[PDB]
Design a binder for these strands. Sequence first.
DNA 1: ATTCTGCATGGAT
DNA 2: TATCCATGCAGAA
Length: 111
Amino acid sequence: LNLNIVPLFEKTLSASDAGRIGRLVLPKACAEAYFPPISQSEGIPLKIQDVRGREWTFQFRYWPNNNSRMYVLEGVTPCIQSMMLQAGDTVTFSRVDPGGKLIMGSRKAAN
DNA sequence: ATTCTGCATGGAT
DNA sequence: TATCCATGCAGAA
Ligand SMILES: [Hg+2]
């Protein structure tokens, strides 16, 4: 059958996202809009392939923030290093239709 | 000291 | 006023 890659959204890494803590923050709008919906704080494990085949597995989860939710992927440090990534570079998420498989990529900062 | 948690804050807009 | 995510910041180990 016929296949296509739908871009979902991107995230320009912050220091907090890029450093040692291992959590990459997702803006709520984007999280709820493009990832599986989730009803509990401690969310689900989420598998994302990269261009060169490799599956990564993060916990996709959130906490109560104000009267809403703040969202994150936990356990990302391996992947960031593997991709030689820093604050200011950018990660792009993307979906493959039909079937809705999640994949990812990144690019270096503008300089 | 250190890393991990689980939020809460407040700066930026 | 409001929103909200980058970073603070305390337990707990
Ligand atoms: Hg990654």
